[PDB]
Design a protein around this ligand. Sequence first.
Ligand SMILES: Nc1ncnc2c1ncn2[C@@H]1O[C@H](COP(=O)(O)O)[C@@H](O)[C@H]1O
Length: 366
Amino acid sequence: FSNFPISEETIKLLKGRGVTFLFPIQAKTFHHVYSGKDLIAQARTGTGKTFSFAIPLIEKLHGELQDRKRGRAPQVLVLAPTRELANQVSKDFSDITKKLSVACFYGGTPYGGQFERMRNGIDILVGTPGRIKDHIQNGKLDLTKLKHVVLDEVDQMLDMGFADQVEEILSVAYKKDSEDNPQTLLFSATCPHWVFNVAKKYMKSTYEQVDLTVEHLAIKCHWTQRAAVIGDVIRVYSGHQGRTIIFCETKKEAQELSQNSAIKQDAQSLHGDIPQKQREITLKGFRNGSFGVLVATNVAARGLDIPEVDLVIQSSPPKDVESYIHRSGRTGRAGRTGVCICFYQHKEEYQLVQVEQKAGIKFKRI
Ligand SMILES: Nc1ncnc2c1ncn2[C@@H]1O[C@H](COP(=O)(O)O)[C@@H](O)[C@H]1O
């Protein structure tokens, strides 16, 4: 915890909860929270949202700790949508502070126990909007002495219809336009319109906000039409004076394809079953413009000097992903965007996702 001003006492209590270092949401918000800045945080479940406000709030409060006076008003108000979530936030506070009085006020429980806690004095108050609004009406609860307000799981509170109850509580604790109002920490995962209306009505003018080359095409094609569609994509992306390299896994398929009526007239084959003398000649032919289509096998190309192309075609999702990405970087001539086409069948659909994941690319599925 070296980067942060967390006391040795708090560090020891934190190790009991299995906290030895801060999660990203915590490290990013700590100083905004500690320094008293207003904040809107967007974070998913399990990211450690509770400690991102609890740890810096407890540290700030511990540093300004004035004698525990009976009947004291809360300094912190945490609004939570449910009893279950309010009890977890309370426990999280209680487990890392042995100096501050932590109260949990939810509805559908006797008022007596809560009135007693209010008389003894509260430092940190966690509660559901209903019960907090009740004790405001009673007069018994004083929320005009607040330094900090946390609106936890805002989305859930809105989905449950607590918008108007929260706005009522906010109207008591906040003065419209005051730069002296409590510090507001808003926790909304999706940030609906209500969040930005609350921010411009109750929050400070300035607030922090924290969140948490080649075209690759994939064509679904039945093997019986592949050669016809190959002729069509060449016509479109390569055309006249163009260069296309087709990659076929088997030496048979590559030979069969270079001889297919759709491309045969402008194509030449290249594989392991062709002499080194024929290979250097076909490479010269491709490089000088004797033919525009070079049909090859993924392995029989590995160390070969292939010129810049306009279009790369894989007959099926490649096994050899590094050969695919290397050849992809040599596509696109005269400032035109390079095009890599990948043909696939329904059985090869997850294979496409594997290529996407290994290569760090996303295919346009057509
Ligand atoms: N820095 C941390 N190290 C270890 N566990 C943590 C840390 N921050 C939060 N947690 C735990 O992660 C879980 C999810 O946190 P939360 O989303 O706040 O409920 C809880 O069980 C926390 O106790």
